[PDB]
């Protein structure tokens, strides 16, 4: 309703959308139906150490 997660296909188990479970391809204008949401980087708290 407000926040975006990623699940597996056959069982609802939501997880935070990071750079580990997603892969980067292309840019924004080609994909039809794309949305806007932040993708979390796990390296940032280690950079804040």
């Amino acid at each position: 309703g407000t926040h975006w997660f990623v699940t597996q296909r056959n069982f609802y188990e939501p997880q935070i959308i990071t750079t580990d479970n997603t892969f980067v391809s292309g840019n924004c204008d080609v994909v039809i139906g794309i949305v806007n949401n932040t993708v979390y980087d796990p390296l940032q708290p280690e950079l804040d150490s």
Partner: protein, 50 residues
């Protein structure tokens, strides 16, 4: 998304579909449209049922 999961089934990543969706749709429409011409011209395909 169903077509993307079919491509992920046959070992091709989803960005191939999501960057060529219009081309894939046009190819599918042409492939369906050839079938009507083939069935209207050649009536010997139904030899098993005949």
């Amino acid at each position: 998304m169903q077509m993307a999961y079919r491509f992920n089934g046959i070992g091709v990543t989803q960005n191939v579909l999501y960057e060529n969706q219009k081309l894939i749709a046009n190819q599918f429409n042409s492939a369906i449209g050839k079938i009507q011409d083939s069935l209207s011209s050649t009536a010997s395909a139904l030899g098993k049922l005949q």
